[PDB]
Design an enzyme around this catalytic site. Structure first.
Site, mmCIF file in Angstrom:
data_model
loop_
_atom_site.group_PDB
_atom_site.id
_atom_site.type_symbol
_atom_site.label_atom_id
_atom_site.label_comp_id
_atom_site.label_asym_id
_atom_site.label_seq_id
_atom_site.Cartn_x
_atom_site.Cartn_y
_atom_site.Cartn_z
ATOM 1 N N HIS A 40 0.481 -1.227 -0.029
ATOM 2 C CA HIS A 40 -0.235 -0.300 0.173
ATOM 3 C C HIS A 40 0.678 1.496 -0.332
ATOM 4 C CE1 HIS A 40 0.565 0.358 5.012
ATOM 5 N NE2 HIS A 40 0.136 1.270 3.996
ATOM 6 N N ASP A 84 -0.073 -7.586 1.522
ATOM 7 C CA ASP A 84 0.564 -6.086 2.285
ATOM 8 C C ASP A 84 1.681 -6.351 1.751
ATOM 9 O OD1 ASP A 84 0.522 -3.617 1.221
ATOM 10 O OD2 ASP A 84 0.262 -3.523 4.254
ATOM 11 N N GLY A 175 2.449 6.130 9.439
ATOM 12 C CA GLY A 175 3.228 7.289 8.639
ATOM 13 C C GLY A 175 4.967 6.334 9.002
ATOM 14 N N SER A 177 4.597 2.599 8.133
ATOM 15 C CA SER A 177 4.164 1.695 6.815
ATOM 16 C C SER A 177 5.161 1.715 6.313
ATOM 17 C CB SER A 177 2.675 2.596 5.956
ATOM 18 O OG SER A 177 1.650 2.569 7.432
ATOM 19 N N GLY A 178 4.820 -0.438 5.953
ATOM 20 C CA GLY A 178 6.162 -0.743 5.438
ATOM 21 C C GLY A 178 7.205 -0.615 6.408
HETATM 22 C C1 LIG Z 1 -4.550 6.709 8.570
HETATM 23 O O1 LIG Z 1 -4.099 7.105 9.053
HETATM 24 C C2 LIG Z 1 -3.695 7.049 10.474
HETATM 25 O O2 LIG Z 1 -3.755 7.144 11.994
HETATM 26 C C3 LIG Z 1 -3.338 5.209 10.769
HETATM 27 C C4 LIG Z 1 -2.246 4.604 10.243
HETATM 28 C C5 LIG Z 1 -1.516 3.306 10.809
HETATM 29 C C6 LIG Z 1 -0.745 2.268 10.052
HETATM 30 C C7 LIG Z 1 -0.326 1.514 10.159
HETATM 31 C C8 LIG Z 1 -0.127 0.606 11.508
HETATM 32 C C9 LIG Z 1 -1.131 1.586 12.451
HETATM 33 C C10 LIG Z 1 -1.496 1.040 13.643
HETATM 34 N N1 LIG Z 1 -2.190 1.041 14.526
HETATM 35 N N2 LIG Z 1 -0.659 -0.523 14.337
HETATM 36 C C11 LIG Z 1 -1.439 2.744 11.907
HETATM 37 N N3 LIG Z 1 -4.331 4.141 10.210
HETATM 38 C C12 LIG Z 1 -6.009 4.188 10.966
HETATM 39 O O3 LIG Z 1 -6.605 4.626 11.721
HETATM 40 C C13 LIG Z 1 -6.407 3.140 10.028
HETATM 41 N N4 LIG Z 1 -8.611 2.753 10.105
HETATM 42 S S1 LIG Z 1 -9.703 3.263 10.297
HETATM 43 O O4 LIG Z 1 -10.574 2.136 10.807
HETATM 44 O O5 LIG Z 1 -9.711 5.063 9.945
HETATM 45 C C14 LIG Z 1 -9.383 3.013 7.791
HETATM 46 C C15 LIG Z 1 -9.602 1.745 7.694
HETATM 47 C C16 LIG Z 1 -9.333 1.607 5.955
HETATM 48 C C17 LIG Z 1 -9.507 2.963 4.733
HETATM 49 C C18 LIG Z 1 -9.739 2.799 3.674
HETATM 50 C C19 LIG Z 1 -9.692 4.528 6.019
HETATM 51 C C20 LIG Z 1 -9.461 4.408 6.957
#
Ligand SMILES: COC(=O)[C@H](Cc1cccc(C(=N)N)c1)NC(=O)CNS(=O)(=O)c1ccc(C)cc1
Ligand SMILES: [Ca+2]
Length: 223
Positions: A40, A84, A175, A177-178
């Site tokens: 992603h 992913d 941030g 991610s990956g």
């Molecule tokens: C995107 O913004 C965020 O604050 C986190 C990021 C993230 C990324 C990887 C791991 C973690 C972690 N907790 N360990 C967090 N993800 C979210 O908050 C996503 N949840 S969500 O329920 O808000 C969601 C799900 C799917 C879409 C398309 C958009 C939003």
């Protein structure tokens, strides 16, 4: 990273920052010319940054190398984030040394209960936003699939695993991610997704690398 600690300049030599005019994802150097990240995090025109600590200040140990090829997993599903994972090839091999080194792929899968090291320049707040300029570290154990499913009622595939704390307060975040999830000196996971950050009963879900070793090895051998 939420509830973590400052790693220390270059103490995580295999951590990389993917940059497209700004840091948007983490990655892991698996060899002189290949990086692994989350599918992603795909984007064109990616420049990989190695030997980083403060991603905003040139400190002297950096190596900036453009990607020449990005390979998303053939079965990557963006809706469920199954598989992913993504491979990136550098235009030139990086100069390996003490501050820039690769991490070994795992020979076997890690069991629930093991302690792992997660790192990244991601957000550090559970409510609000604040991005650190230097690398943050976090120790987190792998959770059993059953307890994960229970507290979050999420659908975890055999290609995923949860790590962190069900009590919240410590977790990977936006941030990160990956980024790498290292356990026993091997790359066992990649920061994939989760609901918010450090939420109670909402641990982080990570890509299970041990299942993609054949794929990774074959792909590198022909590209
Ligand atoms: C995107 O913004 C965020 O604050 C986190 C990021 C993230 C990324 C990887 C791991 C973690 C972690 N907790 N360990 C967090 N993800 C979210 O908050 C996503 N949840 S969500 O329920 O808000 C969601 C799900 C799917 C879409 C398309 C958009 C939003
Ligand atoms: Ca720097």
């Amino acid at each position: 990273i939420v509830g973590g600690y400052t790693c220390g300049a270059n103490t995580v030599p295999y951590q990389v920052s993917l940059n497209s005019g700004y840091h948007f994802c983490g990655g892991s150097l698996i060899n002189s010319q290949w990086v692994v990240s989350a599918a992603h995090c795909y984007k064109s025109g990616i420049q990989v940054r190695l030997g980083e600590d403060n991603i905003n200040v040139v400190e002297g140990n950096e190596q900036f190398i453009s990607a020449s090829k990005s390979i998303v997993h053939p079965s990557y599903n963006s809706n469920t984030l199954n598989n992913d994972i993504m491979l990136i090839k550098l235009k030139s091999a990086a100069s390996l040394n003490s501050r820039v080194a690769s991490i070994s792929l795992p020979t076997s899968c890690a069991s629930a209960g093991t302690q792992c090291l997660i790192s990244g320049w991601g957000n550090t707040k559970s409510s609000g936003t604040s991005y650190p300029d230097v690398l943050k570290c976090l120790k987190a154990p792998i959770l059993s699939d059953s307890s994960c499913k229970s507290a979050s009622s999420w659908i975890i595939t055999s290609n995923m695993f949860c790590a962190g704390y069900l009590e919240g307060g410590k977790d990977s975040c936006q941030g990160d991610s990956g980024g790498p999830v290292v356990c026993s000196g091997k790359l066992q996971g990649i920061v994939s997704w989760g609901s918010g950050c450090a939420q109670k009963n909402k641990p982080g879900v990570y890509t299970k690398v041990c299942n993609y070793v054949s794929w990774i090895k074959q792909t590198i051998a022909s590209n």
